[PDB]
Amino acid sequence: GMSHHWGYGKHNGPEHWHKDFPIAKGERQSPVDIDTHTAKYDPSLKPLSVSYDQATSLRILNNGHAFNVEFDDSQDKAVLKGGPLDGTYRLIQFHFHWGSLDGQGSEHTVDKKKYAAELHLVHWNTKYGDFGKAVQQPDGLAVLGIFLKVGSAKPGLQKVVDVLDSIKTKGKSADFTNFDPRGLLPESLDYWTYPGSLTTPPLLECVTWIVLKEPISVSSEQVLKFRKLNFNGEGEPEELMVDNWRPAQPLKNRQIKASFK
Ligand SMILES: Nc1ccc(C(=O)c2ccc(-c3ccc(S(N)(=O)=O)cc3)cc2)cc1
Numbered sequence: 001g002m003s004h005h006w007g008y009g010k011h012n013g014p015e016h017w018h019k020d021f022p023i024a025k026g027e028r029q030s031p032v033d034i035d036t037h038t039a040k041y042d043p044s045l046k047p048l049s050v051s052y053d054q055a056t057s058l059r060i061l062n063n064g065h066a067f068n069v070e071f072d073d074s075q076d077k078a079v080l081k082g083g084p085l086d087g088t089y090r091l092i093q094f095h096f097h098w099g100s101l102d103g104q105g106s107e108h109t110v111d112k113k114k115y116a117a118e119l120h121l122v123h124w125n126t127k128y129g130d131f132g133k134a135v136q137q138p139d140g141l142a143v144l145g146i147f148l149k150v151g152s153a154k155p156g157l158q159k160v161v162d163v164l165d166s167i168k169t170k171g172k173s174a175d176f177t178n179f180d181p182r183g184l185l186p187e188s189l190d191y192w193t194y195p196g197s198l199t200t201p202p203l204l205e206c207v208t209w210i211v212l213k214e215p216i217s218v219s220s221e222q223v224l225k226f227r228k229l230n231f232n233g234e235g236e237p238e239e240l241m242v243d244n245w246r247p248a249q250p251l252k253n254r255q256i257k258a259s260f261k
Pocket residue numbers: 120122131132133135136143197198199200201202
């Protein structure tokens with residue numbers, strides 16, 4: 001991706017992506033608007049299983065598009081299974097998408113409602129051996145999406161907020177061990193699920209999306225720190241990292257299933 005030039009600006013944003021990534025106009029693109037009245041309860045869906053007890057984080061990186069909290073996925077730890085999934089998916093990283101204002105920022109929307117941000121916990125299907133091979137498969141990844149609204153602070157998110165000062169610009173990373181992703185989960189695991197794609201280039205259609213119905217609350221101060229990050233690298237004109245979200249895409253030939261009635 002040494003020659004990629006996509007971003008979220010007026011000349012390289014989502015509406016431009018299809019030129020270098022034609023799959024952008026594909027049959028199973030993400031995100032999508034979740035029409036709560038049309039999503040059908042599927043009694044066959046099994047309970048979701050999120051086992052993060054042994055998760056081991058290693059580093060946090062500003063990649064110029066968002067910041068990723070990376071995990072050591074060399075061993076069978078931090079796994080997502082159950083729900084609509086067959087097999088076991090291993091946690092590799094999580095990141096967020098957010099807005100310049102509290103009124104926008106999420107990628108998925110609920111009955112057209114936009115949340116202030118959206119957390120993505122990315123997992124890859126162990127049957128494919130590694131992350132790189134998994135993204136080349138239709139059932140290669142499982143991304144758990146969690147909406148963020150502004151209200152009370154999320155204690156579990158503060159460690160992340162405080163380390164952002166050290167990775168302000170593109171390319172910067174910092175040691176980030178012992179971060180517990182369980183602190184970012186809402187109480188309920190009720191969810192909607194549908195087949196989709198990565199929401200940023202290469203936009204590969206390799207994701208089983210599992211979006212939780214219950215948002216988590218974060219404080220205004222916490223999301224304000226997210227907005228102080230930079231898309232640019234050190235020594236370059238400052239472009240605040242805000243509105244790094246892709247808008248809802250056509251649902252086309254797909255059905256969104258609900259795990260609850
Ligand atoms: N064959 C490949 C190997 C690695 C890669 C990547 O480096 C890569 C980059 C970004 C992503 C990615 C992951 C999650 C999301 S999201 N926002 O839908 O959760 C977006 C992009 C996936 C793979 C792509 C193709």
